């Protein structure tokens, strides 16, 4: 369900600010604010209140020491201990332009040369936020540095400024759950006589101000064994009744989303704790340990195997590994939902359907025949 | 057909080991094993037998030479050539933390700084494998380094260890073939009156222990002019009768996979030898040489042009280049398959269908009318 989300501008809050530094008489205000002071709060001509730093003061060396010498036609440096010192200072500035020369202006993630860990923690500490957002990003620097952009702003009036755009987390400590779907399918000896469906709404779910968010992209989310660290730029909101779909599939309050096909493949899904192995047709599906080999052989149909005592799930020729976290698994012994539907008449071709929508197609086709 | 493959954890066999170095009393075992020995075989508490190295011995320099000096309040280094040597030795350790500061712990591909080429050959030579897998891995280092993961494991007890995860090739020297598909369409002057279908089972096919594997992703596979170097983590197995589909499309042993639409575009496919140029509607499809210009002009419908004497295939406004390998091409003069079906009744909307499934839809729709 990757197409249903809206498309938005990645960094439109950084380019907007950089367009303000270009108007005449602005960059002089920043220079005046940073007069014998590294970090100071400045107000732009746009109306925002940005925070500025003065990293890599390089004028104090070249202008004070090396400039009067090389302009005298008989320059003579004293010792090699100065050249080596100067090469180290002139190394950070080279890496910045080298990294800007291939990305054409916008960099992600911000590298250590741009905003080092020694100054990122100083930039976080003075942001206008609460005492918990600071705590979250202070101990997770390697994540907030992976979702930050930098943009070339201005080099005018003998000063270089590039805007660094940092993420700001608004919602903290709400429970996110994630569901993994497998294509349950009916089993028959004669191929082509088996129909089946599979749920499509897989991804991350968790609340946001009395509702539920839903990220359809399962790879654009991080994990720190307790947090998700995803973003709302590519999330579609849903009514808070989506939780009832998992336990009551046939509820009328909110219909779920399914897709249907007439093909089956022995494919597994590696969950957080165990694997949803689903072997069909004629294949050898196995879950083996690393010290004793084969310990279980599945039959046709959906099956679940925990990660406690199982370290390798093999299906056909592939060999999937299983995550090794620690959590109490559970098994709800139900009955497959596919046996209700009649394989004779069935909307076998769907890509974005629903329980109600598929029900209507069967209801229309079955009743249409019953005329005479 | 990218959604039909199962999803699995990319690096779950390394995080499992990294979680074993954390429990108390384990990292001392590794340190004791590497006592006056660089490479040695160690057995962990998980029952596995990993292979460990002692790269970048740095305690022998700082602790022996530079430590007694800088703690005397009147330090004095003798000469400048000592400093330059120390900067080179300390350079590798800085680059490792720089690579971990933006990837949040997991790095891929492993860079030269982490596991150098002079060492990866020595690490391969002692892997418990046969004498043919070693030869394959030793002459293709630049590929086995592109499929390797590294994880920041532990820095506890004054020692830094990071687990390097290397691929292990199990199946070698079985013939892999790949098929390319083009949307053949019928040609009529009146637009909207032409249908067509195209095969979707494009990718890499080759055997795996009495069966056939299938990688639908044509981009996640390498080429060394004889090898594929694919991975089974994102492949779905199939019965060994798929090869009969290419020569006998209408065979009942195994049905092929097709998709159907009522639109046609002049799109080419660059194969390993030549291009499957298919120009429709009103477009100028041309194959030209680099020293003589135009040498061929195709008509409406599918066509094939070899790479012997042809160095450029142009369709519409684009200009595709043709690969220049050396092989014996062939042409099987058959008849288009679309001419059988009647354009009047036809399932124009399909995304995942089969020859039988489309046949059933026409069979039911044509016979239903035949009542009266």
């Amino acid at each position: 369900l990757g197409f249903l989300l809206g498309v938005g501008s990645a960094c439109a809050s950084g380019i907007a600010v950089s367009k303000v530094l270009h108007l005449e008489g602005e960059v002089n205000k920043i220079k005046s604010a940073l007069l014998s002071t590294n970090k100071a709060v400045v107000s732009l001509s746009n109306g925002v209140s940005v925070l500025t730093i003065k990293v890599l003061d390089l004028k104090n060396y070249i202008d004070k020491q090396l400039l009067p010498i090389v302009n005298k036609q008989s320059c003579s440096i004293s010792n090699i201990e100065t050249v080596i010192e100067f090469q180290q200072k002139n190394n950070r500035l080279l890496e910045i332009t080298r990294e800007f020369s291939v990305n054409a202006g916008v960099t992600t993630p911000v590298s250590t040369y741009m905003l080092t860990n020694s100054e990122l923690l100083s930039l976080i500490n003075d942001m206008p936020i609460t005492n918990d957002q600071k705590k979250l990003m202070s101990s997770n620097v390697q994540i907030v540095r992976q979702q930050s952009y930098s943009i070339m702003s201005i080099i005018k009036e003998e000063v270089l400024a590039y805007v660094v755009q940092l993420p700001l987390y608004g919602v903290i400590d709400t429970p996110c759950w994630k569901l993994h779907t497998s294509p349950l399918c009916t089993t028959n000896t004669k191929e082509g006589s088996n129909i089946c469906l599979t749920r499509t709404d897989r991804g991350w779910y968790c609340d946001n101000a009395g509702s539920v968010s839903f990220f359809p992209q399962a790879e654009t989310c991080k994990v720190q064994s307790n947090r998700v660290f995803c973003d709302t730029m590519n999330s579609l909101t849903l009514p808070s009744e989506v939780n009832l779909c998992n336990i009551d599939i046939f509820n009328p309050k909110y219909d779920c989303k399914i897709m249907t096909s007439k093909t089956d493949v022995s494919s597994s899904v590696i969950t957080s704790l165990g694997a949803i192995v689903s072997c069909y047709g004629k294949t050898k599906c196995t879950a083996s340990n690393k010290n004793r080999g084969i310990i279980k052989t599945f039959s046709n149909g959906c099956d679940y195997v925990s990660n406690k005592g199982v370290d390798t799930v093999s299906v056909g020729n592939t060999l999937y590994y299983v995550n090794k976290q620690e959590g109490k698994s559970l098994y709800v012994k139900g009955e497959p939902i596919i046996n209700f539907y009649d394989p004779l008449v069935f909307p076998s071709s769907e890509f974005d359907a629903s329980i109600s929508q598929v029900n209507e197609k069967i209801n229309q086709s079955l009743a249409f025949i019953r005329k005479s | 057909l990218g959604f039909l493959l199962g999803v699995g954890s990319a690096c779950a066999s390394g995080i499992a080991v990294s979680k074993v170095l954390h429990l108390e009393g384990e990292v001392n075992k590794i340190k004791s094993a590497l006592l006056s020995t660089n490479k040695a075989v160690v057995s962990l508490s998980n029952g596995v037998s990993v292979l460990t190295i002692k790269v970048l011995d740095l305690k022998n320099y700082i602790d022996k030479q530079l430590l007694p000096i800088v703690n005397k309040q009147s330090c004095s280094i003798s000469n400048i050539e000592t400093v330059i040597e120390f900067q080179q030795k300390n350079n590798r350790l800085l680059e490792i933390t720089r690579e971990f500061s933006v990837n949040a712990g997991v790095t891929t591909p492993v860079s030269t700084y982490m596991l150098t080429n002079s060492e990866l050959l020595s690490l391969i030579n002692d892997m418990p494998i046969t004498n043919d897998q070693k030869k394959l891995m030793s002459s293709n280092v630049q590929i086995v380094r592109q499929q390797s993961y590294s994880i920041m494991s532990i820095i506890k007890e004054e020692v830094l260890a990071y687990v390097v995860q290397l691929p292990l090739y199990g199946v070698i020297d079985t013939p892999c073939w790949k098929l390319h598909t083009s949307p053949l369409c019928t040609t009529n002057t009146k637009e909207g009156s032409n249908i067509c279908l195209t095969r979707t089972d494009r990718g890499w096919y080759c055997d795996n222990a009495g069966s056939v594997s299938f990688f639908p992703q044509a981009e996640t596979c390498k080429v060394q002019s004889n090898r594929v170097f694919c991975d089974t983590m994102n492949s779905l197995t199939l019965p060994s009768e798929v090869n009969l589909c290419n020569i006998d499309i209408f065979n009942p042993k195994y049905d092929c996979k097709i998709m159907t639409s009522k639109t046609d575009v002049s799109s080419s496919v660059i194969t390993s030898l030549g291009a499957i140029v298919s120009c429709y509607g009103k477009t100028k499809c041309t194959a030209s040489n680099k020293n003589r210009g135009i040498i061929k002009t195709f008509s409406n419908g599918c066509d094939y042009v070899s790479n012997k004497g042809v160095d450029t295939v142009s369709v519409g406004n684009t200009l595709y280049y043709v690969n220049k390998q050396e092989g014996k091409s062939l042409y099987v003069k058959g008849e288009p398959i679309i001419n059988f079906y009647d354009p009047l009744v036809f399932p124009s909307s399909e995304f995942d269908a089969s020859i039988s499934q489309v046949n059933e839809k026409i069979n039911q729709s044509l016979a239903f009318i035949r009542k009266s």
Partner: antibody
Framework: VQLVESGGGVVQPGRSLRLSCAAS????????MHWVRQAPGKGLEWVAV????????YYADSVKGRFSISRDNSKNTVSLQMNSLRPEDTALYYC????????????????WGQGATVT | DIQMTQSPSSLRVTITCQASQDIKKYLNWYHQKPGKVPELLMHDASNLETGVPSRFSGRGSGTDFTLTISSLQPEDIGTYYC??????????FGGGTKV
């Protein structure tokens, strides 16, 4: 690295007895614990196994139903409870550790300690 | 349950033990000094654990398992034990010699 246990003494057949076995050093919450007894001069025999998580238990077939084993991770100690003791239990016990981490399958003993005596 | 018979009971020293079922390679060998703790010699009937010399060796099979000693040493006296750790948790030690 060593683990010690208590609970020695003599009790007439018919009185219960619960003996604990403390542990230090290794990470207690990632290992399983066994209990093996040995009559003086005779051979060792295995009695009960508690899993690392604590939801799995397997008493010896010869002596089952009158045995109870408990495991605590907060105080990293293991306690074995007996009742209706019969005079063939007069032996030296042993509270031992396994050699594999975080598995529901058990592979022998690796670390032992000075055992306790009963009756 | 699997009863385990070890011979020769109470005897270079070589000790052979059999089993009532077919256990692939799940044999551990224990060495207990008189009045001391039973330190473990080897696991999986072939691999020697750290803390013992290379004199000890093991041979495994589907039915019987054999322990062999390269040469006797003064600090190599005491009883020996065998263990099986097949699929199910039930563990059986069996008898022991007196070397």
């Amino acid at each position: 690295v060593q683990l010690v246990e208590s609970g020695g003494g003599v009790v007439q057949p018919g009185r219960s007895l619960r003996l604990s076995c403390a542990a230090s050093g290794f990470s207690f919450s990632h290992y399983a614990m066994h209990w093996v007894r040995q009559a003086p001069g005779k051979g060792l025999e295995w009695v009960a196994v508690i899993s690392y998580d604590g939801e799995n238990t397997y008493y010896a077939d010869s002596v089952k139903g009158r045995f109870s084993i408990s495991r605590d991770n907060s105080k990293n100690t293991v306690s074995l409870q007996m009742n209706s003791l019969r005079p063939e239990d007069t032996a030296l016990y042993y509270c031992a550790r396994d050699r594999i981490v975080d598995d529901y399958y058990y592979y022998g003993m690796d670390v032992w300690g000075q055992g306790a005596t009963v009756t | 349950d699997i009863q385990m018979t070890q011979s020769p009971s109470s005897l270079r020293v070589t000790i052979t033990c059999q089993a009532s079922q077919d256990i692939k390679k799940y044999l551990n060998w224990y060495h207990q000094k008189p009045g001391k703790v039973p330190e473990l010699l080897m696991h999986d009937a072939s691999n020697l654990e750290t803390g013992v010399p290379s004199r000890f060796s093991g041979r495994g099979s589907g039915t019987d398992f054999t322990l062999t000693i390269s040469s006797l040493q003064p600090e190599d006296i005491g009883t020996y034990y065998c263990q099986q750790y097949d699929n199910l948790p039930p563990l059986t030690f069996g008898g022991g010699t007196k070397v």
